[PDB]
Structures are given as structure tokens and as C-alpha cells.
Design a protein around this nucleic acid. Structure first.
Ligand SMILES: [Cl-]
Ligand SMILES: [Cl-]
Ligand SMILES: [Cl-]
Ligand SMILES: [Mg+2]
Ligand SMILES: [Mg+2]
Ligand SMILES: [Mg+2]
Ligand SMILES: [Mg+2]
Ligand SMILES: [Mg+2]
Ligand SMILES: [Mg+2]
Ligand SMILES: [Mg+2]
Ligand SMILES: [Mg+2]
Ligand SMILES: [Mg+2]
Ligand SMILES: [Mg+2]
Ligand SMILES: [Mg+2]
Ligand SMILES: [Mg+2]
Ligand SMILES: [Mg+2]
Ligand SMILES: [Mg+2]
Ligand SMILES: [Mg+2]
Ligand SMILES: [Mg+2]
Ligand SMILES: [Mg+2]
Ligand SMILES: [Mg+2]
Ligand SMILES: [Mg+2]
Ligand SMILES: [Mg+2]
Ligand SMILES: [Mg+2]
Ligand SMILES: [Mg+2]
Ligand SMILES: [Mg+2]
Ligand SMILES: [Mg+2]
Ligand SMILES: [Mg+2]
Ligand SMILES: [Mg+2]
Ligand SMILES: [Mg+2]
Ligand SMILES: [Mg+2]
Ligand SMILES: [Mg+2]
Ligand SMILES: [Mg+2]
Ligand SMILES: [Mg+2]
Ligand SMILES: [Mg+2]
Ligand SMILES: [Mg+2]
Ligand SMILES: [Mg+2]
Ligand SMILES: [Mg+2]
Ligand SMILES: [Mg+2]
Ligand SMILES: [Mg+2]
Ligand SMILES: [Mg+2]
Ligand SMILES: [Mg+2]
Ligand SMILES: [Mg+2]
Ligand SMILES: [Mg+2]
Ligand SMILES: [Mg+2]
Ligand SMILES: [Mg+2]
Ligand SMILES: [Mg+2]
Ligand SMILES: [Mg+2]
Ligand SMILES: [Mg+2]
Ligand SMILES: [Mg+2]
Ligand code: NA
Ligand code: NA
Ligand code: NA
Ligand code: NA
Ligand code: NA
Ligand code: NA
Ligand code: NA
Ligand code: NA
Ligand code: NA
Ligand code: NA
Ligand code: NA
Ligand code: NA
Ligand code: NA
Ligand code: NA
Ligand code: NA
Ligand code: NA
Ligand code: NA
Ligand code: NA
Ligand code: NA
Ligand code: NA
Lengths: 73, 237, 56
RNA sequence: GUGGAAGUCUGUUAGAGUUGGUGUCCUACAAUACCCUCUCGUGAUCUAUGUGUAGGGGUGAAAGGCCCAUCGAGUCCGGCA
RNA sequence: GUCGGGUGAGAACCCCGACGGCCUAAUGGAUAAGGGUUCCUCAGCACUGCUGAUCAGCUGAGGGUUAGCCGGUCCUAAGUCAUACCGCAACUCGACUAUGACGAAAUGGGAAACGGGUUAAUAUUCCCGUGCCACUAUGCAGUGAAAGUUGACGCCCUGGGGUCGAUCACGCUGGGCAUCGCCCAGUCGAACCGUCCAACUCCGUGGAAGCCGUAAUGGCAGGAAGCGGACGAACGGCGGCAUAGGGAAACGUGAUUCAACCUGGGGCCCAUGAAAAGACGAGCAUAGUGUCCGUACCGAGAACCGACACAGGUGUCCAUGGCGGCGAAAGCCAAGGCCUGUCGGGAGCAACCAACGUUAGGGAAUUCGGCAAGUUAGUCCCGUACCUUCGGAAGAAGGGAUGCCUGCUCCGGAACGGAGCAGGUCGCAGUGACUCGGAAGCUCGGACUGUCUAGUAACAACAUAGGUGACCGCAAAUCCGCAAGGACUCGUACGGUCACUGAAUCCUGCCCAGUGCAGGUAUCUGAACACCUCGUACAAGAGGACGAAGGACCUGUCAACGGCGGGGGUCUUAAGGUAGCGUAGUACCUUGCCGCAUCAGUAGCGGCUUGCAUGAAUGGAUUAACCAGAGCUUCACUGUCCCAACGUUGGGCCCGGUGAACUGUACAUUCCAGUGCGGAGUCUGGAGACACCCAGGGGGAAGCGAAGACCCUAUGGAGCUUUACUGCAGGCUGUCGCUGAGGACUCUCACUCCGGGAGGAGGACACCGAUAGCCGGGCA
RNA sequence: CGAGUGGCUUGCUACCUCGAUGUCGGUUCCCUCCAUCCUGCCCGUGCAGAAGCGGGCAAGGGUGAGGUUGUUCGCCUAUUA
RNA sequence: ACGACCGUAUAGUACGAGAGGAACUACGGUUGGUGGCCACUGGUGUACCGGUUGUUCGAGAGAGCACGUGCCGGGUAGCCA
């Protein structure tokens, strides 16, 4: 997490980096299979190490509040 | 005095240009004779150095291989379709007319065939509200209600990479690297930090602007700095 | 660093060379233009009225 | 315990920089040098070569700094006795 | 450097030997740029060489550079040019679009060479031997042949494969030493051809419901382990090459750690890490062809840039030589190089100076200030406060240990790897030299790393993430161009432009009167064309009607410029200072008052505080961490001081050689007084005064150096500013031309934009040309 | 209230120097003046003594060390004839 | 080329109600200044001797280098306070 920042940057900066990245690094449940093997490949790119499915998602999360609204509509 | 920095920009020298040669593709919708038959498959997902957002590589039936402004939720294997009779799923492109109202769209054309102009940045999206035989009313991310020829094509879904703006750069170092991939001079020195000769706000024994910051729309380049034709400033009221 | 003596040391770049056209050592090999005769810029030879007193 | 993150630490590794000595020098070794001391040293890093921007114009993390020992408007010749 | 010797007319510095030293990422080896013959040989010393010279990078004359397989050449990169097109009065000018070409010699890509020998000087170029590549021809094979692969790629961590090197063991060959038995060198052998294959991927078998596996992550009924197989690596192993070569000889075998090279796994990005030629895909024999350019030497404390044989500057590779140790560190020493950071001889060698060592007792009394110097130090064990953003503070502080010798234990496969034990034992001192933090506390500032005044400023200044406001839907906002055109932009509001503020935390009050910006506007004001009236046979010209932007007027807006008082229990001019903070880096009075601290404190810190003249993004308060930033206190330390001394090295002094510059109206041995344009070696009066020379420290020559920067003067200059004067771009707006049909409207045909086209949007507007009004330090 | 001396302060003047007479404070080293702070010799006393106060001659010698401040000045401390 | 102070005896005396408290003179010492000297104490003493770390000469012995002594201990003459 944010610990690599030492006593630099301040509270809000690094609290939001740990938060974004903790969610960022969470086991994600893949769209194709149902397995929780989705990891970020880069900015907005996600893949599942299990079947290798490579997806377009949020920048720090595979799904964004807006991406879900689409499914419905 | 000397030309201010905003005038230096205009000259288009190395320092202000965009590292174009390092860019991948000019994301634009495909041209289709008609019929809509055109479909293709998602061969891969890449990073767009020009938009800090993901982009999809696609292989069309007629052999054509082109990168595509990738909406959220497109993966490798998926089949996208472009045409009047395109199915109505995320990733597919078709004129606003064939699109059902109430649906989120991105990479909208300003005039049919231009290849898409509106809503293309990370996680944004337009909102198709009203239909008609003559006008298609779309709500662009800025919130403006834009009237468009129902023939302007567009992509279903919201642009991928959403939420990029949520996390702070944290350190100069990170801005640095981002900036180097854009047509932008960075960092930024404050006008009031410069010398009278370099900027209308420069000079003085302390740092403050000479006159008020709101400048007239009619101000000539060289003078037009600060708050441009501001309709109001501050937060009060 | 001194812009003087200490900055003279990096000067091992070749620029002005023997010109094919006028024979002067003024052909800027990086610009491919002669500063003396204009070769590489003008078909006509470089010449100016200010190269001499106004009435001469 | 493992892992090995960092505009992270120590560091005359290489390299970069230049705080104090207001030392030595000051018809110098040198039109910006010598020594000790000191700062950085995985990064907004340092560096070679190639390449772009030209004078009321460039370039400037801004000191009116820099653009060949030349800068609050380069240099050369001319206007010019 | 020194002693001998060689050559020579001549020898400190040219050469040989010995002895003594210097250089270890360089003072060695190979090179890029740049130089340009500086390279080698012979002959010389008038020039050059910090002295000399028989020497030389000097002078003169000769000689020297050999390539199918090393570079160029070829490809394409940022980008550049040429032609066409268009612009411009015009071009040697100018943007776009086409096409073509150029653009990489260490250091991008890339068909192919190794070993030995040879010259005064070349060498993967010559010679000897061996090997390899491309093209073409002939012949056999082959119909395949273009899909694909490769070329071809970021940063961090890491496993395995593995050569050289280094080391260890043992054997052989040669050498050294001479109380031992030790110590050193060597023990060789290529390209290439052939062969072997770990890793990754995949196939079959198998059938795990908890096992498999890693340094770590991890894997699996969507099929784990195990077993069998396909593909598949090294500049590596192995065989050939090789009764080649090389060595005086022997002409080794194993091992460990393993640069190169090969091959995997993981992690990071608001950063995504070239292209093209070419190669492979796609056999073999024989033969022919492989031209053109570079090739010497230096590569630096003398061959480069810096006027110089300049203590400066200048890129790459050798980062694996030994001991040491964490180490590419110190220190010492190999190989290699050097005694050319090129003037010497003499004096116990004084004064004085530069670098430096040691100083009793005291211990910052020195000083603006602890400036300078010193103290501390490596490693292990114990132990560690306030504060804090919970990361940190922290190596806090403080305490202890530390060698050698003998014999052992533990971890590991092992190391010539690490951790420990017991006993013995020497010194004042065991990180014994070297290497190697002094520590603690208060306050100010900026949050942090970073930037800057090349050459007196490194800071508190800039930047920064973070906060905030403004503009714009893309035929945009902003910006460049005279134009043709262009940056932003392979971009599209989670954007990018224009500004302010400057991390976190708590917060950010009141004011729209002035100024700015923006919106509205009945009425008022408001130019030109057209129109109407008067005038003129026309025309000048006077007047009227209409009225755009703009202004008056009204509104919005301060995280827009900025403001936040006097008086009384409202007045100027809108409000009348809120939270905080406060004698401030802001406080005139001022050394404010009180306290802490000291013998004594214009300092410092805390409290008070009526604040000459604090205060909220002109941001306020506060704040952990950080800092060659500013002030202060304590412990420790010490030649900073009391108060100086002795010593070390290089100068200084004498001698040989070389050999400048600054400065000079004249005269000049001056001193005390006086006088003078009031600051005299020179006048006047006195006094003193034999001439010359050496060394000194600098009192005077208002010493030398610079036509004073300060100040004033000049109808001098320049940069900068603005509601100074006058103008100019540019923006807005009306009108006319392009421009067409039927104070509001439709259409389509010019013209514009979108579309590959069909066609779609727009449309007499817009764009452009002309003109008129407003704004107009952006510019002159 | 009146008369003076000095040339340390301050002011005034604009004579001298603008082809430059290097600033304040400090330091170090040298000479001097007396309007004498101490020391020697004296006079008066509201001089018992002791300790003082005031005055005369007199420049031989001495007149030191520290805390704040760049300070001069001054404020403060402990020594001192 | 000497300036000045303190102390003892004078003396608890003269003087004085008392408290308190002199002098002349003779002595001892201190301080500042001055000139000289080194038996004594102290400093130096890269003369010298010893201890010892790293490395090199194979070990030993004996040596070089570690800035002009590697460091530590002792230190004669001389020069000094
Ligand atoms: Cl950004
Ligand atoms: Cl070459
Ligand atoms: Cl692995
Ligand atoms: Mg594009
Ligand atoms: Mg932001
Ligand atoms: Mg970060
Ligand atoms: Mg850029
Ligand atoms: Mg800034
Ligand atoms: Mg400034
Ligand atoms: Mg200006
Ligand atoms: Mg400010
Ligand atoms: Mg310059
Ligand atoms: Mg660091
Ligand atoms: Mg460091
Ligand atoms: Mg460059
Ligand atoms: Mg300035
Ligand atoms: Mg020049
Ligand atoms: Mg030679
Ligand atoms: Mg000769
Ligand atoms: Mg080429
Ligand atoms: Mg190459
Ligand atoms: Mg040679
Ligand atoms: Mg050669
Ligand atoms: Mg030399
Ligand atoms: Mg001492
Ligand atoms: Mg003091
Ligand atoms: Mg003092
Ligand atoms: Mg210091
Ligand atoms: Mg074991
Ligand atoms: Mg030590
Ligand atoms: Mg202060
Ligand atoms: Mg800072
Ligand atoms: Mg400077
Ligand atoms: Mg600094
Ligand atoms: Mg500096
Ligand atoms: Mg700042
Ligand atoms: Mg900001
Ligand atoms: Mg911002
Ligand atoms: Mg406010
Ligand atoms: Mg105070
Ligand atoms: Mg401000
Ligand atoms: Mg003058
Ligand atoms: Mg002036
Ligand atoms: Mg002027
Ligand atoms: Mg177009
Ligand atoms: Mg002006
Ligand atoms: Mg003078
Ligand atoms: Mg008298
Ligand atoms: Mg006297
Ligand atoms: Mg020695
Ligand atoms: Na200003
Ligand atoms: Na852990
Ligand atoms: Na320095
Ligand atoms: Na100019
Ligand atoms: Na002239
Ligand atoms: Na092989
Ligand atoms: Na080693
Ligand atoms: Na010599
Ligand atoms: Na740093
Ligand atoms: Na107002
Ligand atoms: Na207003
Ligand atoms: Na204020
Ligand atoms: Na810094
Ligand atoms: Na000393
Ligand atoms: Na003198
Ligand atoms: Na100026
Ligand atoms: Na003068
Ligand atoms: Na002075
Ligand atoms: Na006296
Ligand atoms: Na004082």
C-alpha cells in the first residue's frame, strides 16, 4: 500500500492511494468464467490468469459505476 | 515586452508539440458501404499513449485490422458489429437513429461520417435522450444538450478506463511522465512570479497581479491571460 | 561551469567545411549551405551591397 | 517468515552538483583554476551523438537566466565621417 | 632520483646496468570526435623545448597506410532537402499536400574470418594454413513460395544453464630462496563442421476432491503428480579442425564461486517503452565473380578545444589481477607504463609566508558567529524520550564487547562462506594503520525529492502534488502566420486551454460604492452606406429620419483588482476585522513589561499585548518528516583565546642557467613647522644630511590599477509601467462588393463544411476584400 | 545675566578632490594632548579618627577582564589603586 | 627600567562616649612592565628506542610503503615559558 511513501505526501493523498490500490489489487471475479482470477494488466486493462480473458474496465477497478448502468439500459 | 508563453505555443515548436510519432492510431469509426454486414473480432486490448485509456485491436471480416476506441466491458474474443443493422450491445457502432433512447453512448460523430468526435475520454459517455426523423438530442458529458443529425454514428456504452481522475498523482515525478506524452509544456510558472517584461502579471516588489484578472473577450493575444471573459468568479453566491 | 575556458573543451564538432562551389571553408556540413557563396541555398551567388561602403 | 516497494537512507562506485574555508591563486596553471569541506547518487537522474526553435525572436522549474569569454534585446558588415 | 658506464667538441636531465621510487578506472590496454603526417629511418641544432641537450611532437630529406567476410557503403529514426502545387510585389522567402532523395563509421538495424607468421613503419587487409558468406553460370534435386516467423525493443526483483577469470587440491615442467620448506611462472591450442539440451510451449498416458511446486508468486476434474513423446539454447559441453599452430620444457586432472553468452519466473505504468532494409520460410555439386572509399600515428598534466608542450575541458570499452574488506572504498602490491605533472647547485637551511604535526594548566574567556580546527567513528549485543500524518522520530540518547593462539560446535552440498563455544595469552591502546556519525533541546521559514542567478546570491525565491476560479461541444476555447497555411491534435469536457494558491490537518468571516469581467436594457447617447429636405442645371456643403456594437442605466460576480476607518450610545466611500495569530523576517515608540536562563543576556524562548502599520487561497492558524536555509541553549571537544613554543615539507637567502611585466613631466638624502586653490620631498624658515649596496615589514608619494558606480547637469540613451501624448495590430459591430429566387419569412443556384461516391448540413449568411464606430501598453 | 576658550558633537558654508584621496565598527602597532580617573606632593572642610567631599601642582607610569548589541555610545557583572 | 598593590610589626595603639580605628619607619610578598637565562618544572624534539595494524620482499631474520613519523608509548641535545 501507501507505506512505500514514508512520512511524505500527507494523509488524504496516500489514504486514497491505499484505498484505490487495495480495491485495485482485490480478487476480481471474471466476466467470461466465474473465477476470481482477474488482475490489472495496466491502465484500464484486465485479464484472467485462469482462461486468459483480457477485458476493458475501469482504471483501478474492472467495473465502474457507469459500466454497470450500461448493462441495464 | 517579450511574447508571453501562450504565444510561444502557437509557433508549434518541438517543446509544444505532441510526440505524435509515438502515437498508435487515430481512432475513428469504420466506413461501411451500407448493409451493416461489417463485423469483426476483438484480437487484443492495448494502451493508448495519447489518451491514457485502453484501446481495442479488431480484425474485421474483410481482412481489415484496425484499433478501436474501446468502451468498458470489451474483451478478447468478442464480436463487434458496425452498421445500421448492428445488434444493440456494448462495443457496437450504429447511427443514433437505430439506437434506443435512454442508452449510454460514446465516440459520437458531429456530422455523419466524421468518425466520432464527442465523448471519448476515460469513463465518459453521452446520453441519447430524444429521437426524431430530423433531430437526435444528445446530452454530452459536459451536460450540454446537443442536437445531432440522427445519421451521426456512435458507440454503445461508456468509454473504458473510468475513474482515472480519482487517484492523486501524489508526486511531481508522476505528472512529469504523463505530461511527456502530451502536447504540453510542463511545469508551469505563475505569471505573478515573472518579470513585467514577461507577463502582464509580472513585476512588483511582491507577488500580485497588477490589474484585475478578468480580461475582456476582445483582448488581443499577449494580454489575454488570467480569467478569460469570466461570467463570475469565486465561489460565493 | 565557466562559459569561458572550461566550455571550450567540448568543441570537437565539425560544421563549416571547404565549399565545393567557392572553395572557402564556409560550407556548413550540417546545414548544407555555404555561408560565403550561398551554395545550397541560392543558385545565384551570395552578394550584398553592404559588403562595401555605400558609395563604392 | 517470505517478498523487495521507494522522486527512501548511508556512500569521493561511476557520474552529477557546488555549502563553508570569505584558504591557495589573483601581471594565475586558469579571461572563473587548485586544495580541504560539503550536496545528489533508481530518478522531475546523469551522459554521448544526431536533430528542432533565431534576435523584439528563441529558450526559460522565472535568476531578466541562457542563445559560442558578447544579453533589460546576440554577432557581423552597412546606414556612418 | 643516485652510483657506475656508453656516445659526443660539449652530458644533471640522450642511451645501457644496478640501486631507489611514481601511476592501479589510471600515468596501463583498445578507441569515437577532433588533429593531419605529428607515424618510421637517416642527417642535423639557426628556430621551438620554462635551464642544457649529442634528444625531440623541432629543422631537412627520404619512406610508410594493401581487406568479398573490420568500418563505410545498404536500411530506416528525430528530422532535412529537392521537384510539383499554392502564397508573396518578389525571391536566395513561406506553411500544407504529393513524389523523390538525404539523415546513424565509438553507440540503432546488419550476409560472411579464425589461428599463426612477418616489417624500421601496415595487418581479422600481406604471407602460411583453415574456414565462411553473397551473387552469377553449369548440373542434379524441387514445384513447392507466401502465410507465417525473425529483424524487433521499457523500468524493478529474481531462478536456472554456463565460459573466462580468480581460488583450492593433487601431478608434471622451469625458476627463486637457503636454518625451516616455502614462494613464483607455466602446464596452451581458434574460427568453423558435426553433435548434445536445460527453460518455455504442446501431445498421449494417468486420474489427484487435497495434492503438486517455487527464491517468491503460484498450479489443477476446463484434468494435479508420475510416466512416455513432439518442438526446442549458449560466444557452453563433447568430437573433428590438429603427427594445424605455439612452447626451453611439461605440453594436467578435479573442484568451488562463476563477468560474457543462453534461457525462465515475478512485479510496475494517469509513463505502454522505433522503424525499415534484410534474414528465415526455401536442397546440394562444381566454377566464376566480390569493384569503389577508410586503414599511418596521437587520443591527451606535449599530437583534440582552450592564443601555449595551459594543474582547465573532452564520449565509449577493459567494473573479474593479488592481499584487504560490505565494497568498482582506503592502504599495499602485480602486469603494463613512467622518473617529462621536466631547470639545477648550496647554507641546520635566519626573519617572513604556504601547507602541516605536537603542545602543560585552563576550556569558547576568542569571534558578528565555535569561522578554523577538533571530538565521534567500522561491527555485534543490550537499550532508546518528546512528538507523529503511525510511515517515522532512531544509528535518538545511554551501556558493553572487539586482538592473537589452541581445540571445537552450529547453518549449508560446499566455499579459500556465515554464526557461535571453551581454554590459553600479549600490549597504554585489538574497527591498533587505513577506512570510519559528535550528541541533545528551543524558535523562524519552505511541507517533502527537485529548480536557479554558466562567472560574488542555492535561500525563505521557482517548481511540485494538492486546493480553487475562468473559457470552450470541436467549423470550439487558446495560440502562430502577410498569405498560402499552422500548434494544440493519431487530442474531444475523467478533455486542454488561461490564471491564482501551494502537501496533510482545522479553517477560509464582512463588502459589488470605485475598477475589472459578464448579462440585461423602456428610455437617453451612438458612425458610415442607403434614404428624405435644403443647396448646386452637377458637385462641395448644411440639416433630417433610422440606429449596430459600445456607453448612460439596472443586475450578477471578491478562491476578480482590492477594502475591512474616524467619531458617538452615525460620517467618508460599499463594509468596518470574524477564527486565529500578535513587540512578528510585520511593532515607530523599544533594550516595551513579567518570567526563564547567565555573575552579568539590545540575543534566544514563554506569557502579556491597545497590532506606528496582523488576519483568512493578496490565503489564516498549525504542523510529523525533510534541509550545505535564519536565531538561540546544553553536554562533549579542542591552540578560537589566555600566550605563545618547538618541529615537518615547499619557498624565502647564496650560486649557474633562463628571463618578463606594472610603472616613469622633471628634479629628488629628507624631517619639523609655516605658507599656498583651505591635504607640499620641490615655496618660506629652520633642523638634519658623506656615497654605494643587501635583507625587511609596507608609514608617505592624498602610491599603482579604472575619463566615479554615489550626486547633480545634458531641451543624452535604453529597459520597464500606466486612466501621459499620439498612433498601430487585434477583437467586437454597422455598411458595400462576392450575391441569387419568392421589419419579419421561405427557398436554392453561387459560396462553405461533412461524405470514397451517391448524397448530407448550412446558405445568400458565413469566409474573403473595402469601409465606419467602439475597445485596444498586445505593440511603436 | 554677562565675558570667553576649545575644535570632540551637531548645524551652516560650498573653498579643495567627481580622468575616484576605498565606508562604519573592530582589530593590531606607534606617537601625542590635559580639561587628571588612579598613583606623588599639597590647600580647604559642615577636617576627632577612619571613610569622604571640594580645590591646587602634576601627563612619569597605569587605566584591565567579561554578558546583550555590527554597533560607537550605552546598559549590566565581578574584580580594581 | 621601573609603575602599583596587599600583608606583618608599629597597634587594637594615637583619636574617640562608643562603634570604630590611622601614621612615620622597618620588613615580607603580589601584580604589570623590562632585560637576560635553561640547573629545576613544563613544551617540542618527522635525532633516537620500543610496541603494534595492513601489505610486499616465500617463512624467519631484517626491511619499504601507509604525506611528507602509519598509528601508539618513551624521549637526549638544542630552542623555549
Ligand atoms: Cl494532467
Ligand atoms: Cl574503420
Ligand atoms: Cl523461477
Ligand atoms: Mg485522430
Ligand atoms: Mg487537477
Ligand atoms: Mg506514486
Ligand atoms: Mg513534450
Ligand atoms: Mg508554478
Ligand atoms: Mg524575480
Ligand atoms: Mg506589459
Ligand atoms: Mg504569495
Ligand atoms: Mg555567454
Ligand atoms: Mg534517494
Ligand atoms: Mg548518497
Ligand atoms: Mg542535443
Ligand atoms: Mg530583478
Ligand atoms: Mg564570436
Ligand atoms: Mg618519433
Ligand atoms: Mg637521432
Ligand atoms: Mg543514406
Ligand atoms: Mg552498428
Ligand atoms: Mg603500428
Ligand atoms: Mg593502426
Ligand atoms: Mg608539459
Ligand atoms: Mg593545550
Ligand atoms: Mg564571548
Ligand atoms: Mg570579547
Ligand atoms: Mg566547521
Ligand atoms: Mg551440516
Ligand atoms: Mg581512529
Ligand atoms: Mg524572530
Ligand atoms: Mg524547500
Ligand atoms: Mg553565481
Ligand atoms: Mg543549496
Ligand atoms: Mg554559490
Ligand atoms: Mg513558492
Ligand atoms: Mg494546482
Ligand atoms: Mg489544478
Ligand atoms: Mg476570503
Ligand atoms: Mg518576546
Ligand atoms: Mg498573491
Ligand atoms: Mg568622470
Ligand atoms: Mg543612479
Ligand atoms: Mg528614454
Ligand atoms: Mg475539409
Ligand atoms: Mg511604451
Ligand atoms: Mg590611498
Ligand atoms: Mg593643570
Ligand atoms: Mg607621556
Ligand atoms: Mg614515511
Ligand atoms: Na505583478
Ligand atoms: Na510481510
Ligand atoms: Na567547492
Ligand atoms: Na535585437
Ligand atoms: Na556604421
Ligand atoms: Na556446438
Ligand atoms: Na577482491
Ligand atoms: Na629536464
Ligand atoms: Na534525492
Ligand atoms: Na465593488
Ligand atoms: Na462591481
Ligand atoms: Na489586509
Ligand atoms: Na535540497
Ligand atoms: Na597549531
Ligand atoms: Na610604503
Ligand atoms: Na535599460
Ligand atoms: Na583626481
Ligand atoms: Na576601521
Ligand atoms: Na601622567
Ligand atoms: Na559591551
Amino acid at each position: 500500500r501507501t507505506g512505500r511513501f514514508g512520512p511524505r505526501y500527507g494523509l488524504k493523498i496516500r489514504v486514497r492511494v491505499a484505498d484505490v490500490e487495495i480495491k485495485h489489487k482485490k480478487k476480481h471475479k471474471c466476466p467470461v468464467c466465474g473465477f476470481k482470477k482477474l488482475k490489472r494488466a495496466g491502465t484500464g486493462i484486465w485479464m484472467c490468469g485462469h482462461c486468459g480473458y483480457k477485458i476493458a474496465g475501469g482504471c483501478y477497478q474492472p467495473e465502474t459505476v457507469a459500466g454497470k448502468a450500461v448493462m441495464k439500459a | 515586452g517579450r511574447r508571453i508563453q501562450g504565444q510561444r505555443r502557437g509557433r508549434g515548436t518541438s517543446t509544444f508539440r505532441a510526440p505524435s510519432h509515438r502515437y498508435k492510431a487515430d481512432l475513428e469509426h469504420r466506413k461501411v458501404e451500407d448493409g451493416d454486414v461489417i463485423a469483426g473480432t476483438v484480437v487484443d486490448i492495448e494502451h493508448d499513449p495519447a489518451r491514457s485509456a485502453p484501446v481495442a485491436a479488431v480484425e474485421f471480416e474483410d481482412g481489415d485490422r484496425r484499433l478501436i476506441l474501446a468502451p468498458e466491458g470489451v474483451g478478447v474474443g468478442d464480436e463487434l458489429q458496425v452498421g445500421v443493422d448492428a445488434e444493440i450491445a456494448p462495443g457496437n457502432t450504429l447511427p443514433l437513429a437505430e439506437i434506443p433512447e435512454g442508452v449510454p453512448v460514446c465516440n459520437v460523430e458531429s456530422s455523419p461520417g466524421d468518425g466520432g468526435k464527442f465523448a471519448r475520454a476515460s469513463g465518459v459517455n453521452a446520453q441519447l435522450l430524444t429521437h426524431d426523423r430530423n433531430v437526435a438530442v444528445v446530452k454530452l458529458p459536459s451536460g450540454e444538450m446537443k442536437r445531432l443529425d440522427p445519421q451521426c454514428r456512435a458507440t454503445i456504452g461508456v468509454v473504458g478506463g473510468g475513474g482515472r481522475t480519482d487517484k492523486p498523482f501524489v508526486k511531481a515525478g508522476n505528472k512529469h511522465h504523463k505530461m511527456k506524452a502530451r502536447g504540453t509544456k510542463w511545469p508551469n510558472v505563475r505569471g505573478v512570479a515573472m518579470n513585467a517584461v514577461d507577463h502582464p502579471f509580472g513585476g512588483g516588489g511582491r507577488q500580485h497581479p497588477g490589474k484585475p484578472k478578468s480580461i475582456s473577450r476582445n483582448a488581443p493575444p499577449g494580454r489575454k491571460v488570467g480569467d478569460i471573459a469570466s461570467k463570475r468568479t469565486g465561489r460565493g453566491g | 561551469t565557466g562559459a569561458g575556458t572550461p566550455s571550450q573543451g567540448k568543441k570537437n564538432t565539425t560544421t563549416h567545411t571547404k565549399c565545393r562551389r567557392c572553395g572557402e571553408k564556409s560550407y556548413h556540413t550540417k546545414k548544407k549551405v555555404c555561408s560565403s557563396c550561398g551554395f545550397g541555398k541560392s543558385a545565384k551567388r551570395r552578394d550584398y551591397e553592404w559588403q562595401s561602403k555605400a558609395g563604392e
